Tab-separated table of C-alpha atoms in Angstrom:
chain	number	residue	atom	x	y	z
M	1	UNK	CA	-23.998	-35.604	-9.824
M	2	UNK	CA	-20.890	-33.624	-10.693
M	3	UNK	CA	-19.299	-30.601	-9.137
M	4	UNK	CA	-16.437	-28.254	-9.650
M	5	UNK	CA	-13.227	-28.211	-8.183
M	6	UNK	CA	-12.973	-25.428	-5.234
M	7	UNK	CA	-10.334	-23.522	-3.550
M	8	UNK	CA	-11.059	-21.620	-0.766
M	9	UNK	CA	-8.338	-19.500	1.700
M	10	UNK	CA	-9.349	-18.186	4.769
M	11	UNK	CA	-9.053	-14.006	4.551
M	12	UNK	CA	-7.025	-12.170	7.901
M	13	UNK	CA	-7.851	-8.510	8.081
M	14	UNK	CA	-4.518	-6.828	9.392
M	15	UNK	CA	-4.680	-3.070	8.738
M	16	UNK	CA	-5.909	-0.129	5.876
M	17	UNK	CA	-2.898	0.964	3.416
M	18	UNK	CA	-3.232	4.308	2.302
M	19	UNK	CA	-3.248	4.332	-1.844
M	20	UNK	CA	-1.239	7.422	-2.246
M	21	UNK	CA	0.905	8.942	0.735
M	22	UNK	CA	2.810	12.034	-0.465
M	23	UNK	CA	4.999	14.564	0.979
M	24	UNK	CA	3.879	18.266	1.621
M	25	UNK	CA	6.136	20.743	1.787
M	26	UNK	CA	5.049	23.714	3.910
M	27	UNK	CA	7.051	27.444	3.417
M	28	UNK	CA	7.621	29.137	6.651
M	29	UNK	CA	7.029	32.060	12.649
M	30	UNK	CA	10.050	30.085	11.069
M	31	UNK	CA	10.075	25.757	10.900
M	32	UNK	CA	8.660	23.905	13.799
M	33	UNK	CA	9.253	19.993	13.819
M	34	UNK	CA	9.162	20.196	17.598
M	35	UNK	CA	7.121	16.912	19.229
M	36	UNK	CA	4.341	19.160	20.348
M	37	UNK	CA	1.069	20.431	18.967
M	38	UNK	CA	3.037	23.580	17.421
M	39	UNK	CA	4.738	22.033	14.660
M	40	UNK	CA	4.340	23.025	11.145
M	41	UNK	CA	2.939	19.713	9.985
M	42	UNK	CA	1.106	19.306	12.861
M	43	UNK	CA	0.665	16.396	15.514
M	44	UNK	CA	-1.571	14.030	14.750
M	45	UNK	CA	-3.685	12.224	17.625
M	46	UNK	CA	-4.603	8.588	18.355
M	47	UNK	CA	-8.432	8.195	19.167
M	48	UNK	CA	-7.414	8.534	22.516
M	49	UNK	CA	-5.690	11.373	22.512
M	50	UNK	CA	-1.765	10.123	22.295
M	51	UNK	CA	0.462	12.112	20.344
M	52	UNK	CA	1.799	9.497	17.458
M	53	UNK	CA	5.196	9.538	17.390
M	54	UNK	CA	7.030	11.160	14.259
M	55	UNK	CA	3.668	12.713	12.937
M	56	UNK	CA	5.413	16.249	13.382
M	57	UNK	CA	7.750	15.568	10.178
M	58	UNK	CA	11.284	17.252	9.787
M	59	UNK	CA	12.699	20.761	8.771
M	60	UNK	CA	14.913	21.229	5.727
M	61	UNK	CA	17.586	23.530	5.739
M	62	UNK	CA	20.172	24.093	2.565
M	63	UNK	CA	23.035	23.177	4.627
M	64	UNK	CA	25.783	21.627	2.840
M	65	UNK	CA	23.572	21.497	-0.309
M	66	UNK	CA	25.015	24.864	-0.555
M	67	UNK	CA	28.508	23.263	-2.039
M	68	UNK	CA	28.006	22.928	-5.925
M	69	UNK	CA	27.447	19.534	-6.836
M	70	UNK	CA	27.184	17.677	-3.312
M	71	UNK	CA	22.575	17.357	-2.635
M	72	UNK	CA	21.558	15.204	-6.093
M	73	UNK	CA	19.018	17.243	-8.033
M	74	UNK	CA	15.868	17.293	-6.529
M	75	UNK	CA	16.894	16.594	-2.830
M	76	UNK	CA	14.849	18.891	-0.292
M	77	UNK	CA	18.041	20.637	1.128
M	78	UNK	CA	18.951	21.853	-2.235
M	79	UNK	CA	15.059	22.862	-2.796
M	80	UNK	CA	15.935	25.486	-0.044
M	81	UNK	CA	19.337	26.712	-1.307
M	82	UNK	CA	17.411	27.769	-4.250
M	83	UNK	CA	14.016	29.438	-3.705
M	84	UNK	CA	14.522	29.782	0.490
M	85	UNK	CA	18.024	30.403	1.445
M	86	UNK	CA	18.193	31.187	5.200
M	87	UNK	CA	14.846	29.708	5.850
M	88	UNK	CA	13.818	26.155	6.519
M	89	UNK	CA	11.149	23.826	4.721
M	90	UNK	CA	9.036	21.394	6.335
M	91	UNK	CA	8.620	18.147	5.400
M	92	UNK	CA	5.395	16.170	6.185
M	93	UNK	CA	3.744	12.890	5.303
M	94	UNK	CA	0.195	13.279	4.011
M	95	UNK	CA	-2.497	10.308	3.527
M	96	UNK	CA	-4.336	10.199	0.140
M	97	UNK	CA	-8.129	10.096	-0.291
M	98	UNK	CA	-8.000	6.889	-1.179
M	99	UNK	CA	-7.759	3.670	1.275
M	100	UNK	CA	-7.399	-0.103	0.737
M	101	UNK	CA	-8.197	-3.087	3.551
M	102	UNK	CA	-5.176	-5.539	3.680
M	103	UNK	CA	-5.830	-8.934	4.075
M	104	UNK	CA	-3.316	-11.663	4.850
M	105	UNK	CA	-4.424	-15.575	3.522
M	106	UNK	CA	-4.251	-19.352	4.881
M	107	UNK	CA	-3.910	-22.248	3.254
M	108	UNK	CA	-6.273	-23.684	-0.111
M	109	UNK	CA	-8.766	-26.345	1.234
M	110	UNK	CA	-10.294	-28.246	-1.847
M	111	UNK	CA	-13.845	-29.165	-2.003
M	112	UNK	CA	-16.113	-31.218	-4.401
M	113	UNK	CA	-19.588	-33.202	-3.995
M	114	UNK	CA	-20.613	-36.423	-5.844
M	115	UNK	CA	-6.601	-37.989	-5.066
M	116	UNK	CA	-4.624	-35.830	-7.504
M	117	UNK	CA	-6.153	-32.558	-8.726
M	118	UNK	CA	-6.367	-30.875	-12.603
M	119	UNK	CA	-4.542	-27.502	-11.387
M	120	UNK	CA	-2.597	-27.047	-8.947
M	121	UNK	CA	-3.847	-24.563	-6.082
M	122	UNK	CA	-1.869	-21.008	-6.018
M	123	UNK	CA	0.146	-20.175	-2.810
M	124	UNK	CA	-2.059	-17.071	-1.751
M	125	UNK	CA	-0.035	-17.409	2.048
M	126	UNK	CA	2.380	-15.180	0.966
M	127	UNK	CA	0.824	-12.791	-0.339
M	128	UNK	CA	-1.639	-9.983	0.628
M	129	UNK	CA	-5.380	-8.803	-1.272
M	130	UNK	CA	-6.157	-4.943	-0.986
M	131	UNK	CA	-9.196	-3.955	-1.339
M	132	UNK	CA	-10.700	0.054	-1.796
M	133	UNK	CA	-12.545	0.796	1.738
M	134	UNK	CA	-12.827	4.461	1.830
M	135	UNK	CA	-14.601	6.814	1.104
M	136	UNK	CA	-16.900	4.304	0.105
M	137	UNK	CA	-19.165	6.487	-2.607
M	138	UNK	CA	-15.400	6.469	-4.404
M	139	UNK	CA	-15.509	5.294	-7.880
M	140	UNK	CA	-13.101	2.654	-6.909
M	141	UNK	CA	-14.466	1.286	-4.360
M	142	UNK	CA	-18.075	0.782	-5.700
M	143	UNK	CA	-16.095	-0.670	-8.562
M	144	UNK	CA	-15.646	-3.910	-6.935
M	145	UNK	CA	-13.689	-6.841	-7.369
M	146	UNK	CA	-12.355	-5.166	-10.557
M	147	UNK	CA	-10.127	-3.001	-8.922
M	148	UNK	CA	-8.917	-5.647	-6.254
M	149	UNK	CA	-4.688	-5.621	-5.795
M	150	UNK	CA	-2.708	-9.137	-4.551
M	151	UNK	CA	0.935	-7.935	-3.747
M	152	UNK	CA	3.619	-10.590	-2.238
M	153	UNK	CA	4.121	-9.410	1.582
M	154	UNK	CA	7.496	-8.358	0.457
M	155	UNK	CA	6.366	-5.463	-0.902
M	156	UNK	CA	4.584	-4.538	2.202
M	157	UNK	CA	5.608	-2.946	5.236
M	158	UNK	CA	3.022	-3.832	8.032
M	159	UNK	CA	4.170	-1.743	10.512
M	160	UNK	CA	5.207	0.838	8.401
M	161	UNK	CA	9.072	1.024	9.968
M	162	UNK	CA	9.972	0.149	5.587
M	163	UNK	CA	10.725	2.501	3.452
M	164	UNK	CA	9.003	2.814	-0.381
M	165	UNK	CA	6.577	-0.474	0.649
M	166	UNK	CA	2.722	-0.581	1.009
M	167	UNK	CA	1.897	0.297	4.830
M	168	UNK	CA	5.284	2.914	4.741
M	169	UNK	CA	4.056	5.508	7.509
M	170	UNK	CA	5.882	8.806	9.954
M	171	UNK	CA	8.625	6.157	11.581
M	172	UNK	CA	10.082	5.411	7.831
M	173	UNK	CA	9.599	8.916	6.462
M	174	UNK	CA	11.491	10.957	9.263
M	175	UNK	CA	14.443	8.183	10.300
M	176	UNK	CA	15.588	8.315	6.844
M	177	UNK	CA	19.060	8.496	6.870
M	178	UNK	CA	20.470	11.733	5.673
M	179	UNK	CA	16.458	13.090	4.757
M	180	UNK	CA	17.375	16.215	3.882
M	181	UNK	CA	19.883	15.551	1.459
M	182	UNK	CA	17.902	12.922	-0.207
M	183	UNK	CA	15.140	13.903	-3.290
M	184	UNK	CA	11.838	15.151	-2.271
M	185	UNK	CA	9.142	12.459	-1.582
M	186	UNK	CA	11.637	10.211	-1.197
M	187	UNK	CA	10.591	6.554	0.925
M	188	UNK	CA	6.972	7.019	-0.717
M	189	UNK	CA	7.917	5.009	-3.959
M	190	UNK	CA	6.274	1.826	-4.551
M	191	UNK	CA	3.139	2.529	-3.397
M	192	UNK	CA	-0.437	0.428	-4.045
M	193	UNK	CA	-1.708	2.944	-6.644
M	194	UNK	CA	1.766	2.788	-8.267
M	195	UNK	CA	0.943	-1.159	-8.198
M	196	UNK	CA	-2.127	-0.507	-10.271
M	197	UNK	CA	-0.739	1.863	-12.888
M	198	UNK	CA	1.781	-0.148	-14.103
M	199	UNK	CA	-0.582	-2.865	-14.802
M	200	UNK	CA	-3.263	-0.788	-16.366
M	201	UNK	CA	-0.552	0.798	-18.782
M	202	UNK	CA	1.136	-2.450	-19.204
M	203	UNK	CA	-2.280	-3.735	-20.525
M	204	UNK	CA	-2.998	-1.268	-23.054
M	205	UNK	CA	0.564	-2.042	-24.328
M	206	UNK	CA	-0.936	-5.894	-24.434
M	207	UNK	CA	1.275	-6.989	-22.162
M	208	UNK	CA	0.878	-9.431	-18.482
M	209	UNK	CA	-0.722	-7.342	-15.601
M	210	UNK	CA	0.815	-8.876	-12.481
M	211	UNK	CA	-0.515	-7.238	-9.423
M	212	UNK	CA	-4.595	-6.247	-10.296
M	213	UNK	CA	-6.544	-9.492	-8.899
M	214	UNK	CA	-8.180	-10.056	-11.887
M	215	UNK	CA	-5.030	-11.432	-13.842
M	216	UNK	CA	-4.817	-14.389	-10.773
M	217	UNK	CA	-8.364	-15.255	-11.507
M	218	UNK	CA	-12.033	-14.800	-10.683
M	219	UNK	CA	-12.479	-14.708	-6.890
M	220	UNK	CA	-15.846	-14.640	-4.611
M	221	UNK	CA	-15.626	-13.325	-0.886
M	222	UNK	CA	-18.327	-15.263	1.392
M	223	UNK	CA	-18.769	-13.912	5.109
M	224	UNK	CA	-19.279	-17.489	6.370
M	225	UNK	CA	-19.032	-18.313	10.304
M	226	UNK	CA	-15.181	-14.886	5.783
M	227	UNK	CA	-13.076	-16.993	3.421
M	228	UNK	CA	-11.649	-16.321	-0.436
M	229	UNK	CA	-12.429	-19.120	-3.420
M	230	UNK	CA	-11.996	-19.627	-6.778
M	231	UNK	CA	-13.370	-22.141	-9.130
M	232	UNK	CA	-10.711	-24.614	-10.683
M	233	UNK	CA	-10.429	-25.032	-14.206
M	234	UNK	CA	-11.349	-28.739	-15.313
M	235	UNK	CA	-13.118	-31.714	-13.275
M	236	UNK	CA	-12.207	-34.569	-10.945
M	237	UNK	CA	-10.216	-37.751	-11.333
């Protein structure tokens, strides 16, 4: 006669985060970061065949990194100063192998079959699930649920304008204030496979993973009509 308590949130697909972006750093004709197809990074091309803006990169010069004790160690400018005085380094944002499908959530809508509940529903509205989407035969993504991330949307930057959030893309990396003076892969910290490593090394420590699904609970994705549930520990009242 009796069934289990049931929380279900409806699932919003808003974009793919890239697991890994990192900076490549080409040596150098001399540095082109010129919005054209002749730039050393490269332009990259909408489906349509629309440059996207600030997929050339920048060029890195020593500049005043030259004066002892101005560029922090590790900054790109002092990179050049260096190993390549006179020349120029470029700068470019690169997309890992790796990709994850960001989903935004509703609301919990209980349901039972035969009032104050056992556990209170978690707020999932806030917050975002990633889950592995390419390149499909990837370890990770054939490893299911397992390797599932739920990040709050602060640490997410949708259109990618945000510096060292999930969804960082071109507009934050170039646009940095100051870039070239500034440590080498800087704006790429805080990344989703950053998210996962400290969990997995904070577990074999025996410590709280906070980020991995799997420490929020046991989930199952339905493509009904697609919603996200989870069964409620306990029974009715």
């Amino acid at each position: 006669s009796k069934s289990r308590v049931q929380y279900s949130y409806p699932l919003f697909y808003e974009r793919n985060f890239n697991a890994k972006p990192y900076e490549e750093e080409i040596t150098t004709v001399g540095c082109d970061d010129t919005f054209s197809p002749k730039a050393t990074c490269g332009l990259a091309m909408d489906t349509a065949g629309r440059p996207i803006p600030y997929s050339q990169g920048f060029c890195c010069r020593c500049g005043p990194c030259q004066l002892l004790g101005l560029c922090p160690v590790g900054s790109r400018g002092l990179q050049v100063c260096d190993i390549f005085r006179g020349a120029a380094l470029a700068s470019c944002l690169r997309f890992g192998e790796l990709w994850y499908s960001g989903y935004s959530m509703g609301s919990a809508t209980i349901w039972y079959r035969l009032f104050v509940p056992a556990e209170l529903p978690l707020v999932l509205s806030n917050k975002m699930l990633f889950i592995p989407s390419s390149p499909r035969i990837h370890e990770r993504v054939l490893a299911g649920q397992k390797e599932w991330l739920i990040l709050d949307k602060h640490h997410v930057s949708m259109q990618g304008r945000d510096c060292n959030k999930v969804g960082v893309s071109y507009e934050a990396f170039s646009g940095q204030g100051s870039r070239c003076q500034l440590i080498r892969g800087s704006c790429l910290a805080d990344q989703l496979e950053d998210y996962r490593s400290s969990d997995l090394a904070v577990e074999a420590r025996g410590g709280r993973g906070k980020y991995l699904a799997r420490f929020f609970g046991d989930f199952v994705v339905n493509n009904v009509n697609t919603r996200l549930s989870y069964w409620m520990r306990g029974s009715l009242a």
